[PDB]
PDB file of N, CA and C in Angstrom:
ATOM      1  N   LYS A   1     -26.144  18.988   9.235  1.00 27.68           N
ATOM      2  CA  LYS A   1     -25.366  19.186  10.421  1.00 27.68           C
ATOM      3  C   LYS A   1     -24.133  19.546  10.120  1.00 27.68           C
ATOM      4  N   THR A   2     -22.963  20.244  10.670  1.00 29.32           N
ATOM      5  CA  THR A   2     -21.653  20.497  10.308  1.00 29.32           C
ATOM      6  C   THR A   2     -20.952  19.288  11.019  1.00 29.32           C
ATOM      7  N   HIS A   3     -21.570  18.826  12.394  1.00 31.28           N
ATOM      8  CA  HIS A   3     -20.661  17.933  13.050  1.00 31.28           C
ATOM      9  C   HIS A   3     -21.675  17.030  13.461  1.00 31.28           C
ATOM     10  N   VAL A   4     -21.472  15.545  13.547  1.00 33.07           N
ATOM     11  CA  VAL A   4     -21.754  14.413  13.895  1.00 33.07           C
ATOM     12  C   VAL A   4     -21.485  13.436  14.768  1.00 33.07           C
ATOM     13  N   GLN A   5     -22.312  13.171  16.117  1.00 35.53           N
ATOM     14  CA  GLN A   5     -21.827  11.974  17.438  1.00 35.53           C
ATOM     15  C   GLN A   5     -21.421  10.764  16.514  1.00 35.53           C
ATOM     16  N   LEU A   6     -20.302  10.491  16.856  1.00 35.62           N
ATOM     17  CA  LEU A   6     -19.976   9.249  16.407  1.00 35.62           C
ATOM     18  C   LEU A   6     -19.179   8.123  17.783  1.00 35.62           C
ATOM     19  N   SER A   7     -19.525   6.846  17.971  1.00 38.64           N
ATOM     20  CA  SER A   7     -18.852   5.872  18.635  1.00 38.64           C
ATOM     21  C   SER A   7     -17.949   5.100  17.963  1.00 38.64           C
ATOM     22  N   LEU A   8     -16.838   5.238  17.750  1.00 36.25           N
ATOM     23  CA  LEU A   8     -15.694   4.036  16.570  1.00 36.25           C
ATOM     24  C   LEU A   8     -15.391   3.496  17.233  1.00 36.25           C
ATOM     25  N   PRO A   9     -15.496   2.299  17.096  1.00 37.63           N
ATOM     26  CA  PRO A   9     -14.450   0.903  17.529  1.00 37.63           C
ATOM     27  C   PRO A   9     -13.205   0.918  17.129  1.00 37.63           C
ATOM     28  N   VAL A  10     -12.449   1.101  18.637  1.00 40.44           N
ATOM     29  CA  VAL A  10     -11.099   0.815  18.290  1.00 40.44           C
ATOM     30  C   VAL A  10     -10.517  -0.708  18.090  1.00 40.44           C
ATOM     31  N   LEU A  11      -9.751  -0.628  17.333  1.00 37.52           N
ATOM     32  CA  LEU A  11      -9.459  -2.513  16.680  1.00 37.52           C
ATOM     33  C   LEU A  11      -7.654  -2.126  17.305  1.00 37.52           C
ATOM     34  N   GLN A  12      -7.369  -3.354  17.553  1.00 40.84           N
ATOM     35  CA  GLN A  12      -5.953  -3.765  17.512  1.00 40.84           C
ATOM     36  C   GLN A  12      -5.437  -3.904  16.041  1.00 40.84           C
ATOM     37  N   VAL A  13      -4.064  -3.424  15.739  1.00 43.01           N
ATOM     38  CA  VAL A  13      -3.656  -3.304  14.391  1.00 43.01           C
ATOM     39  C   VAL A  13      -3.815  -4.701  13.582  1.00 43.01           C
ATOM     40  N   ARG A  14      -3.260  -5.527  14.447  1.00 43.44           N
ATOM     41  CA  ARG A  14      -3.316  -7.037  13.961  1.00 43.44           C
ATOM     42  C   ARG A  14      -4.604  -7.786  13.519  1.00 43.44           C
ATOM     43  N   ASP A  15      -5.649  -6.711  13.863  1.00 43.37           N
ATOM     44  CA  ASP A  15      -6.823  -7.662  13.850  1.00 43.37           C
ATOM     45  C   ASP A  15      -7.356  -7.261  12.454  1.00 43.37           C
ATOM     46  N   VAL A  16      -7.115  -5.997  12.198  1.00 44.16           N
ATOM     47  CA  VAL A  16      -7.403  -5.303  10.567  1.00 44.16           C
ATOM     48  C   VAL A  16      -7.299  -6.564   9.430  1.00 44.16           C
ATOM     49  N   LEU A  17      -8.590  -6.780   8.907  1.00 42.54           N
ATOM     50  CA  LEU A  17      -8.835  -7.302   7.834  1.00 42.54           C
ATOM     51  C   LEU A  17      -8.247  -6.379   6.524  1.00 42.54           C
ATOM     52  N   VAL A  18      -8.885  -4.784   6.441  1.00 41.27           N
ATOM     53  CA  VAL A  18      -8.487  -4.365   5.704  1.00 41.27           C
ATOM     54  C   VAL A  18      -7.816  -3.038   5.575  1.00 41.27           C
ATOM     55  N   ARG A  19      -6.756  -2.709   5.445  1.00 39.14           N
ATOM     56  CA  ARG A  19      -5.815  -2.135   6.267  1.00 39.14           C
ATOM     57  C   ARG A  19      -5.510  -0.449   5.575  1.00 39.14           C
ATOM     58  N   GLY A  20      -6.415  -0.419   4.955  1.00 42.01           N
ATOM     59  CA  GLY A  20      -6.764   1.448   4.412  1.00 42.01           C
ATOM     60  C   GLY A  20      -7.980   1.506   3.711  1.00 42.01           C
ATOM     61  N   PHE A  21      -8.014   2.490   2.932  1.00 41.13           N
ATOM     62  CA  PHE A  21      -9.000   3.009   2.317  1.00 41.13           C
ATOM     63  C   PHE A  21      -9.241   3.524   0.743  1.00 41.13           C
ATOM     64  N   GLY A  22      -7.780   2.713   0.248  1.00 43.66           N
ATOM     65  CA  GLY A  22      -7.851   3.068  -1.283  1.00 43.66           C
ATOM     66  C   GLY A  22      -6.213   3.823  -1.447  1.00 43.66           C
ATOM     67  N   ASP A  23      -6.111   4.779  -2.549  1.00 43.95           N
ATOM     68  CA  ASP A  23      -5.064   4.703  -3.283  1.00 43.95           C
ATOM     69  C   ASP A  23      -4.274   6.486  -3.470  1.00 43.95           C
ATOM     70  N   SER A  24      -4.947   7.250  -3.375  1.00 41.23           N
ATOM     71  CA  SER A  24      -5.213   8.104  -3.178  1.00 41.23           C
ATOM     72  C   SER A  24      -5.179   9.133  -2.098  1.00 41.23           C
ATOM     73  N   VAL A  25      -4.994  10.060  -1.721  1.00 42.34           N
ATOM     74  CA  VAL A  25      -5.175  10.943  -0.790  1.00 42.34           C
ATOM     75  C   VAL A  25      -6.965  11.373  -0.971  1.00 42.34           C
ATOM     76  N   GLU A  26      -7.300  11.811  -1.994  1.00 41.79           N
ATOM     77  CA  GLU A  26      -8.461  11.950  -2.275  1.00 41.79           C
ATOM     78  C   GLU A  26      -9.308  10.745  -2.059  1.00 41.79           C
ATOM     79  N   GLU A  27      -8.856   9.952  -2.622  1.00 43.74           N
ATOM     80  CA  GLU A  27      -9.620   8.325  -2.616  1.00 43.74           C
ATOM     81  C   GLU A  27     -10.362   8.336  -0.873  1.00 43.74           C
ATOM     82  N   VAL A  28      -9.081   7.973  -0.303  1.00 43.26           N
ATOM     83  CA  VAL A  28      -8.808   7.898   1.175  1.00 43.26           C
ATOM     84  C   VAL A  28      -9.881   8.570   2.319  1.00 43.26           C
ATOM     85  N   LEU A  29      -9.627  10.042   1.796  1.00 45.90           N
ATOM     86  CA  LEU A  29     -10.583  10.674   2.615  1.00 45.90           C
ATOM     87  C   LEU A  29     -11.841  10.732   2.283  1.00 45.90           C
ATOM     88  N   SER A  30     -12.131  10.309   1.089  1.00 46.83           N
ATOM     89  CA  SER A  30     -13.504  10.201   0.374  1.00 46.83           C
ATOM     90  C   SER A  30     -14.363   8.976   1.476  1.00 46.83           C
ATOM     91  N   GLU A  31     -13.226   7.792   1.128  1.00 46.90           N
ATOM     92  CA  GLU A  31     -14.088   6.473   1.556  1.00 46.90           C
ATOM     93  C   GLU A  31     -14.452   6.754   3.092  1.00 46.90           C
ATOM     94  N   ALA A  32     -13.244   7.127   3.842  1.00 48.82           N
ATOM     95  CA  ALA A  32     -13.435   7.463   5.466  1.00 48.82           C
ATOM     96  C   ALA A  32     -14.522   8.134   5.491  1.00 48.82           C
ATOM     97  N   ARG A  33     -14.685   9.083   5.088  1.00 48.63           N
ATOM     98  CA  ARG A  33     -16.428   9.863   5.428  1.00 48.63           C
ATOM     99  C   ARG A  33     -17.284   8.935   5.192  1.00 48.63           C
ATOM    100  N   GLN A  34     -17.392   7.905   3.609  1.00 48.41           N
ATOM    101  CA  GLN A  34     -18.404   7.210   3.371  1.00 48.41           C
ATOM    102  C   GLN A  34     -18.754   6.181   4.439  1.00 48.41           C
ATOM    103  N   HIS A  35     -17.517   5.403   5.194  1.00 50.29           N
ATOM    104  CA  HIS A  35     -17.331   4.826   5.919  1.00 50.29           C
ATOM    105  C   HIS A  35     -17.876   4.876   7.283  1.00 50.29           C
ATOM    106  N   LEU A  36     -17.608   6.245   7.823  1.00 51.26           N
ATOM    107  CA  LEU A  36     -18.006   6.861   8.854  1.00 51.26           C
ATOM    108  C   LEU A  36     -19.710   7.077   8.623  1.00 51.26           C
ATOM    109  N   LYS A  37     -20.018   7.628   7.767  1.00 51.04           N
ATOM    110  CA  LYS A  37     -21.778   7.682   7.318  1.00 51.04           C
ATOM    111  C   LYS A  37     -22.249   6.356   7.755  1.00 51.04           C
ATOM    112  N   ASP A  38     -21.977   5.342   7.333  1.00 51.92           N
ATOM    113  CA  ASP A  38     -22.434   3.938   7.145  1.00 51.92           C
ATOM    114  C   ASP A  38     -22.223   3.412   8.272  1.00 51.92           C
ATOM    115  N   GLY A  39     -21.124   3.607   9.461  1.00 51.40           N
ATOM    116  CA  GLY A  39     -20.949   2.749  10.545  1.00 51.40           C
ATOM    117  C   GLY A  39     -19.933   1.613  10.023  1.00 51.40           C
ATOM    118  N   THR A  40     -19.301   1.898   9.540  1.00 50.87           N
ATOM    119  CA  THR A  40     -18.324   0.702   9.054  1.00 50.87           C
ATOM    120  C   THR A  40     -17.143   1.236   9.185  1.00 50.87           C
ATOM    121  N   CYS A  41     -16.844   2.296   9.794  1.00 51.46           N
ATOM    122  CA  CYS A  41     -15.154   2.458  10.091  1.00 51.46           C
ATOM    123  C   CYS A  41     -14.899   2.437  11.426  1.00 51.46           C
ATOM    124  N   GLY A  42     -13.836   2.145  11.732  1.00 50.39           N
ATOM    125  CA  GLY A  42     -12.679   1.814  12.970  1.00 50.39           C
ATOM    126  C   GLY A  42     -11.655   2.539  13.048  1.00 50.39           C
ATOM    127  N   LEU A  43     -11.210   2.726  14.410  1.00 52.46           N
ATOM    128  CA  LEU A  43     -10.180   3.509  14.731  1.00 52.46           C
ATOM    129  C   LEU A  43      -8.788   2.444  15.282  1.00 52.46           C
ATOM    130  N   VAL A  44      -7.636   2.649  14.662  1.00 48.17           N
ATOM    131  CA  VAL A  44      -6.439   2.478  15.477  1.00 48.17           C
ATOM    132  C   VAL A  44      -5.704   3.434  16.417  1.00 48.17           C
ATOM    133  N   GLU A  45      -5.383   2.780  17.406  1.00 46.49           N
ATOM    134  CA  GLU A  45      -4.526   3.999  18.099  1.00 46.49           C
ATOM    135  C   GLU A  45      -3.262   3.978  17.850  1.00 46.49           C
ATOM    136  N   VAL A  46      -2.593   5.212  17.676  1.00 43.45           N
ATOM    137  CA  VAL A  46      -1.242   4.823  16.744  1.00 43.45           C
ATOM    138  C   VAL A  46      -0.042   4.692  18.228  1.00 43.45           C
ATOM    139  N   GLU A  47       0.593   3.838  17.953  1.00 42.27           N
ATOM    140  CA  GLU A  47       1.811   3.708  18.784  1.00 42.27           C
ATOM    141  C   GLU A  47       3.171   2.951  17.822  1.00 42.27           C
ATOM    142  N   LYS A  48       4.297   3.018  18.615  1.00 42.94           N
ATOM    143  CA  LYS A  48       5.333   2.580  17.678  1.00 42.94           C
ATOM    144  C   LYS A  48       5.183   1.045  16.835  1.00 42.94           C
ATOM    145  N   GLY A  49       5.320   0.974  15.815  1.00 43.61           N
ATOM    146  CA  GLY A  49       5.103  -0.006  15.091  1.00 43.61           C
ATOM    147  C   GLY A  49       3.825  -0.272  14.233  1.00 43.61           C
ATOM    148  N   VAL A  50       2.692   0.318  14.655  1.00 40.59           N
ATOM    149  CA  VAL A  50       1.582   0.428  13.993  1.00 40.59           C
ATOM    150  C   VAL A  50       1.450   0.768  12.520  1.00 40.59           C
ATOM    151  N   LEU A  51       1.834   2.205  12.066  1.00 38.59           N
ATOM    152  CA  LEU A  51       1.809   2.610  10.977  1.00 38.59           C
ATOM    153  C   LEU A  51       2.416   1.512  10.280  1.00 38.59           C
ATOM    154  N   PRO A  52       3.595   1.224  10.004  1.00 37.32           N
ATOM    155  CA  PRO A  52       3.917   0.323   8.928  1.00 37.32           C
ATOM    156  C   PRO A  52       3.281  -0.785   8.916  1.00 37.32           C
ATOM    157  N   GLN A  53       2.687  -1.515   9.429  1.00 39.23           N
ATOM    158  CA  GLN A  53       1.713  -2.379   9.378  1.00 39.23           C
ATOM    159  C   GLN A  53       0.327  -1.788   8.560  1.00 39.23           C
ATOM    160  N   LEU A  54       0.073  -0.729   8.536  1.00 42.23           N
ATOM    161  CA  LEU A  54      -1.181  -0.202   7.814  1.00 42.23           C
ATOM    162  C   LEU A  54      -0.746   0.308   6.373  1.00 42.23           C
ATOM    163  N   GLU A  55      -1.829   0.850   5.298  1.00 41.93           N
ATOM    164  CA  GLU A  55      -1.616   1.044   4.367  1.00 41.93           C
ATOM    165  C   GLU A  55      -1.628   2.573   3.624  1.00 41.93           C
ATOM    166  N   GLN A  56      -0.693   2.949   3.034  1.00 41.06           N
ATOM    167  CA  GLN A  56      -0.809   4.380   3.077  1.00 41.06           C
ATOM    168  C   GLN A  56      -1.687   4.736   1.575  1.00 41.06           C
ATOM    169  N   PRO A  57      -2.007   5.481   1.269  1.00 40.65           N
ATOM    170  CA  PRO A  57      -2.196   6.878   2.327  1.00 40.65           C
ATOM    171  C   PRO A  57      -3.312   6.426   3.602  1.00 40.65           C
ATOM    172  N   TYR A  58      -2.445   7.367   4.377  1.00 37.31           N
ATOM    173  CA  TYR A  58      -3.422   7.038   6.209  1.00 37.31           C
ATOM    174  C   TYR A  58      -4.378   8.330   5.986  1.00 37.31           C
ATOM    175  N   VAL A  59      -5.599   8.208   6.628  1.00 37.39           N
ATOM    176  CA  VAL A  59      -6.689   8.796   6.874  1.00 37.39           C
ATOM    177  C   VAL A  59      -6.293   9.166   8.804  1.00 37.39           C
ATOM    178  N   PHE A  60      -6.202  10.087   9.228  1.00 36.11           N
ATOM    179  CA  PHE A  60      -6.112  10.068  10.781  1.00 36.11           C
ATOM    180  C   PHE A  60      -7.160  11.078  10.963  1.00 36.11           C
ATOM    181  N   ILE A  61      -7.843  10.703  12.569  1.00 38.92           N
ATOM    182  CA  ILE A  61      -8.711  11.621  13.191  1.00 38.92           C
ATOM    183  C   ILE A  61      -7.682  12.821  14.089  1.00 38.92           C
ATOM    184  N   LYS A  62      -7.637  13.846  14.329  1.00 36.13           N
ATOM    185  CA  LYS A  62      -7.289  14.556  14.929  1.00 36.13           C
ATOM    186  C   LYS A  62      -7.988  15.653  15.881  1.00 36.13           C
ATOM    187  N   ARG A  63      -7.681  16.111  16.850  1.00 34.31           N
ATOM    188  CA  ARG A  63      -8.337  16.918  17.804  1.00 34.31           C
ATOM    189  C   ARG A  63      -8.240  18.306  17.354  1.00 34.31           C
ATOM    190  N   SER A  64      -9.623  19.229  16.872  1.00 36.13           N
ATOM    191  CA  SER A  64      -9.714  20.203  16.034  1.00 36.13           C
ATOM    192  C   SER A  64     -10.058  21.546  17.018  1.00 36.13           C
ATOM    193  N   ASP A  65     -10.175  21.139  18.217  1.00 34.63           N
ATOM    194  CA  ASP A  65     -10.356  21.860  19.355  1.00 34.63           C
ATOM    195  C   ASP A  65     -10.348  21.192  20.647  1.00 34.63           C
ATOM    196  N   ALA A  66     -10.240  22.322  22.421  1.00 33.99           N
ATOM    197  CA  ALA A  66     -10.401  21.836  23.290  1.00 33.99           C
ATOM    198  C   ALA A  66     -11.456  21.874  24.208  1.00 33.99           C
ATOM    199  N   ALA A  67     -14.886  19.519  24.421  1.00 33.49           N
ATOM    200  CA  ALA A  67     -15.213  17.854  24.030  1.00 33.49           C
ATOM    201  C   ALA A  67     -16.431  17.758  24.508  1.00 33.49           C
ATOM    202  N   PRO A  68     -17.837  18.468  24.053  1.00 34.26           N
ATOM    203  CA  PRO A  68     -18.920  18.229  23.874  1.00 34.26           C
ATOM    204  C   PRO A  68     -19.770  16.726  24.160  1.00 34.26           C
ATOM    205  N   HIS A  69     -20.392  16.323  25.324  1.00 34.07           N
ATOM    206  CA  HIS A  69     -20.887  15.569  25.688  1.00 34.07           C
ATOM    207  C   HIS A  69     -20.078  14.006  25.937  1.00 34.07           C
ATOM    208  N   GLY A  70     -18.903  14.227  26.216  1.00 34.33           N
ATOM    209  CA  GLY A  70     -18.089  13.354  26.337  1.00 34.33           C
ATOM    210  C   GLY A  70     -17.206  13.072  24.856  1.00 34.33           C
ATOM    211  N   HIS A  71     -17.489  13.608  23.642  1.00 35.19           N
ATOM    212  CA  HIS A  71     -17.361  13.430  22.268  1.00 35.19           C
ATOM    213  C   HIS A  71     -16.209  14.303  21.932  1.00 35.19           C
ATOM    214  N   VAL A  72     -14.929  14.520  21.855  1.00 33.27           N
ATOM    215  CA  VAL A  72     -13.632  15.023  21.293  1.00 33.27           C
ATOM    216  C   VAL A  72     -14.101  15.498  19.903  1.00 33.27           C
ATOM    217  N   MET A  73     -13.849  16.953  19.947  1.00 35.40           N
ATOM    218  CA  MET A  73     -13.951  17.619  18.218  1.00 35.40           C
ATOM    219  C   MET A  73     -12.900  17.128  17.353  1.00 35.40           C
ATOM    220  N   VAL A  74     -13.588  16.556  16.272  1.00 35.28           N
ATOM    221  CA  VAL A  74     -12.239  15.823  15.515  1.00 35.28           C
ATOM    222  C   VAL A  74     -12.426  16.053  14.067  1.00 35.28           C
ATOM    223  N   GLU A  75     -10.925  16.320  13.221  1.00 32.66           N
ATOM    224  CA  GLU A  75     -11.463  16.332  12.012  1.00 32.66           C
ATOM    225  C   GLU A  75     -10.429  15.511  11.229  1.00 32.66           C
ATOM    226  N   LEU A  76     -10.549  15.111   9.813  1.00 33.41           N
ATOM    227  CA  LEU A  76      -9.937  14.190   9.144  1.00 33.41           C
ATOM    228  C   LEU A  76      -8.847  14.704   8.384  1.00 33.41           C
ATOM    229  N   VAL A  77      -7.692  14.125   8.627  1.00 33.63           N
ATOM    230  CA  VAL A  77      -5.951  14.350   7.463  1.00 33.63           C
ATOM    231  C   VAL A  77      -5.632  13.301   7.068  1.00 33.63           C
ATOM    232  N   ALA A  78      -5.151  13.758   5.947  1.00 32.57           N
ATOM    233  CA  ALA A  78      -4.524  12.138   5.289  1.00 32.57           C
ATOM    234  C   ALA A  78      -3.231  12.407   4.978  1.00 32.57           C
ATOM    235  N   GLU A  79      -2.215  11.428   4.992  1.00 33.09           N
ATOM    236  CA  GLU A  79      -0.921  11.368   4.894  1.00 33.09           C
ATOM    237  C   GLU A  79      -0.423  10.293   4.131  1.00 33.09           C
ATOM    238  N   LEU A  80       0.495  11.044   2.826  1.00 32.10           N
ATOM    239  CA  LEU A  80       1.108   9.963   2.012  1.00 32.10           C
ATOM    240  C   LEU A  80       2.323  10.642   1.661  1.00 32.10           C
ATOM    241  N   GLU A  81       3.892   9.790   1.646  1.00 30.72           N
ATOM    242  CA  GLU A  81       4.871   9.923   2.012  1.00 30.72           C
ATOM    243  C   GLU A  81       5.259  10.925   2.483  1.00 30.72           C
ATOM    244  N   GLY A  82       4.783  10.975   3.790  1.00 29.82           N
ATOM    245  CA  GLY A  82       5.076  12.179   4.746  1.00 29.82           C
ATOM    246  C   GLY A  82       4.861  13.500   4.469  1.00 29.82           C
ATOM    247  N   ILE A  83       4.115  13.231   3.698  1.00 27.85           N
ATOM    248  CA  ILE A  83       3.143  14.802   3.293  1.00 27.85           C
ATOM    249  C   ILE A  83       1.771  14.719   3.941  1.00 27.85           C
ATOM    250  N   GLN A  84       1.101  15.653   4.641  1.00 32.34           N
ATOM    251  CA  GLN A  84      -0.448  15.533   5.429  1.00 32.34           C
ATOM    252  C   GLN A  84      -0.873  16.549   4.800  1.00 32.34           C
ATOM    253  N   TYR A  85      -2.469  16.273   4.280  1.00 34.98           N
ATOM    254  CA  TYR A  85      -3.193  16.886   3.737  1.00 34.98           C
ATOM    255  C   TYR A  85      -4.409  17.375   4.612  1.00 34.98           C
ATOM    256  N   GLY A  86      -4.145  18.573   5.262  1.00 32.97           N
ATOM    257  CA  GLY A  86      -5.207  19.298   6.320  1.00 32.97           C
ATOM    258  C   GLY A  86      -3.976  19.517   7.443  1.00 32.97           C
ATOM    259  N   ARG A  87      -4.377  20.373   8.126  1.00 29.99           N
ATOM    260  CA  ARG A  87      -3.607  21.065   9.270  1.00 29.99           C
ATOM    261  C   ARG A  87      -4.765  20.823  10.427  1.00 29.99           C
ATOM    262  N   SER A  88      -4.125  20.083  11.366  1.00 30.90           N
ATOM    263  CA  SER A  88      -4.828  19.807  12.588  1.00 30.90           C
ATOM    264  C   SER A  88      -4.170  19.700  14.092  1.00 30.90           C
ATOM    265  N   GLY A  89      -5.011  19.241  14.948  1.00 28.28           N
ATOM    266  CA  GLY A  89      -4.034  19.072  16.142  1.00 28.28           C
ATOM    267  C   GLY A  89      -3.453  17.500  16.395  1.00 28.28           C
ATOM    268  N   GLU A  90      -3.736  17.163  17.584  1.00 29.60           N
ATOM    269  CA  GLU A  90      -3.069  15.392  18.100  1.00 29.60           C
ATOM    270  C   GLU A  90      -3.745  14.737  17.607  1.00 29.60           C
ATOM    271  N   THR A  91      -2.990  13.677  16.960  1.00 27.21           N
ATOM    272  CA  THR A  91      -3.559  12.147  16.657  1.00 27.21           C
ATOM    273  C   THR A  91      -4.311  11.676  17.509  1.00 27.21           C
ATOM    274  N   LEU A  92      -5.775  10.955  17.453  1.00 26.00           N
ATOM    275  CA  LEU A  92      -6.623  10.143  18.383  1.00 26.00           C
ATOM    276  C   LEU A  92      -6.284   8.804  17.993  1.00 26.00           C
ATOM    277  N   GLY A  93      -5.911   8.814  16.226  1.00 25.70           N
ATOM    278  CA  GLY A  93      -5.645   7.319  15.720  1.00 25.70           C
ATOM    279  C   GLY A  93      -5.842   7.668  14.186  1.00 25.70           C
ATOM    280  N   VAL A  94      -5.935   6.061  13.590  1.00 28.84           N
ATOM    281  CA  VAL A  94      -5.980   6.107  12.455  1.00 28.84           C
ATOM    282  C   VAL A  94      -7.063   5.296  11.709  1.00 28.84           C
ATOM    283  N   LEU A  95      -7.676   5.917  10.778  1.00 28.34           N
ATOM    284  CA  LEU A  95      -9.097   5.298  10.631  1.00 28.34           C
ATOM    285  C   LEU A  95      -8.977   4.257   9.600  1.00 28.34           C
ATOM    286  N   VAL A  96      -9.653   3.167   9.580  1.00 26.52           N
ATOM    287  CA  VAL A  96      -9.547   1.768   8.920  1.00 26.52           C
ATOM    288  C   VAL A  96     -11.268   1.347   8.705  1.00 26.52           C
ATOM    289  N   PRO A  97     -11.117   1.004   7.502  1.00 24.76           N
ATOM    290  CA  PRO A  97     -12.110  -0.051   7.321  1.00 24.76           C
ATOM    291  C   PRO A  97     -12.733  -1.419   8.754  1.00 24.76           C
ATOM    292  N   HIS A  98     -14.221  -0.937   9.087  1.00 26.99           N
ATOM    293  CA  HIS A  98     -14.600  -2.066   9.801  1.00 26.99           C
ATOM    294  C   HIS A  98     -15.385  -3.114   9.079  1.00 26.99           C
ATOM    295  N   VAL A  99     -14.992  -4.504   9.328  1.00 26.59           N
ATOM    296  CA  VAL A  99     -15.615  -5.746   8.879  1.00 26.59           C
ATOM    297  C   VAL A  99     -16.122  -6.300   9.344  1.00 26.59           C
ATOM    298  N   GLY A 100     -16.121  -6.338  11.028  1.00 29.02           N
ATOM    299  CA  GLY A 100     -16.845  -6.886  11.960  1.00 29.02           C
ATOM    300  C   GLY A 100     -15.615  -7.655  12.815  1.00 29.02           C
ATOM    301  N   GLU A 101     -13.958  -6.868  12.961  1.00 30.90           N
ATOM    302  CA  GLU A 101     -13.123  -7.469  14.172  1.00 30.90           C
ATOM    303  C   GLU A 101     -13.939  -6.690  15.045  1.00 30.90           C
ATOM    304  N   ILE A 102     -13.304  -7.579  16.493  1.00 25.33           N
ATOM    305  CA  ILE A 102     -13.966  -7.278  17.753  1.00 25.33           C
ATOM    306  C   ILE A 102     -12.922  -6.124  18.297  1.00 25.33           C
ATOM    307  N   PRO A 103     -13.796  -4.965  18.685  1.00 25.34           N
ATOM    308  CA  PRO A 103     -12.810  -3.962  18.865  1.00 25.34           C
ATOM    309  C   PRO A 103     -12.555  -4.041  20.632  1.00 25.34           C
ATOM    310  N   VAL A 104     -11.507  -3.411  20.953  1.00 26.10           N
ATOM    311  CA  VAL A 104     -11.028  -3.497  22.395  1.00 26.10           C
ATOM    312  C   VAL A 104     -12.002  -2.087  23.312  1.00 26.10           C
ATOM    313  N   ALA A 105     -12.187  -1.123  22.503  1.00 28.59           N
ATOM    314  CA  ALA A 105     -13.052  -0.255  23.203  1.00 28.59           C
ATOM    315  C   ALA A 105     -13.785   0.713  22.339  1.00 28.59           C
ATOM    316  N   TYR A 106     -14.291   1.670  22.577  1.00 28.01           N
ATOM    317  CA  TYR A 106     -15.079   2.823  21.896  1.00 28.01           C
ATOM    318  C   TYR A 106     -14.554   4.065  21.886  1.00 28.01           C
ATOM    319  N   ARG A 107     -14.521   5.109  20.926  1.00 28.75           N
ATOM    320  CA  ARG A 107     -13.656   6.382  21.124  1.00 28.75           C
ATOM    321  C   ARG A 107     -14.897   7.262  20.499  1.00 28.75           C
ATOM    322  N   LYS A 108     -15.661   8.021  21.582  1.00 28.67           N
ATOM    323  CA  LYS A 108     -16.747   8.934  21.241  1.00 28.67           C
ATOM    324  C   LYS A 108     -16.072  10.301  20.873  1.00 28.67           C
ATOM    325  N   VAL A 109     -16.304  10.558  19.320  1.00 25.67           N
ATOM    326  CA  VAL A 109     -15.957  12.070  18.766  1.00 25.67           C
ATOM    327  C   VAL A 109     -16.986  12.866  18.197  1.00 25.67           C
ATOM    328  N   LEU A 110     -16.764  13.884  18.047  1.00 25.50           N
ATOM    329  CA  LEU A 110     -17.721  14.882  17.261  1.00 25.50           C
ATOM    330  C   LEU A 110     -16.935  14.833  16.030  1.00 25.50           C
ATOM    331  N   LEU A 111     -17.644  14.612  14.898  1.00 26.49           N
ATOM    332  CA  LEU A 111     -16.553  14.870  13.257  1.00 26.49           C
ATOM    333  C   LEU A 111     -17.255  15.952  12.775  1.00 26.49           C
ATOM    334  N   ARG A 112     -16.781  17.179  12.491  1.00 24.08           N
ATOM    335  CA  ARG A 112     -16.342  17.732  11.442  1.00 24.08           C
ATOM    336  C   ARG A 112     -16.832  17.013  10.077  1.00 24.08           C
ATOM    337  N   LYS A 113     -17.946  17.303   9.769  1.00 22.84           N
ATOM    338  CA  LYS A 113     -18.196  16.827   8.350  1.00 22.84           C
ATOM    339  C   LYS A 113     -18.305  17.809   7.348  1.00 22.84           C
TER     340      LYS A 113
END
């Protein structure tokens, strides 16, 4: 399938133990997709002060369209030193590894895989 319904745990930035997916744009997009497939991916909602507490490159989920079965359609965009790799809509948050942190909510998305 081109799209997968996922429910992503929403983490507080100060709880996150592993604050990025790796060291290159290509690695972070790769690892993000592996963790999404394995159910080991969390979501941090972007507000003032959040991104400087996480590791670059960043992997965003961005709205890809205007929401089947409650799931917003999203795709992955990476960012490194102010350059983005991909072009999409509004940021729903930044993806991070999930290693058992307690979430504050769940975000239902339809992920373009």
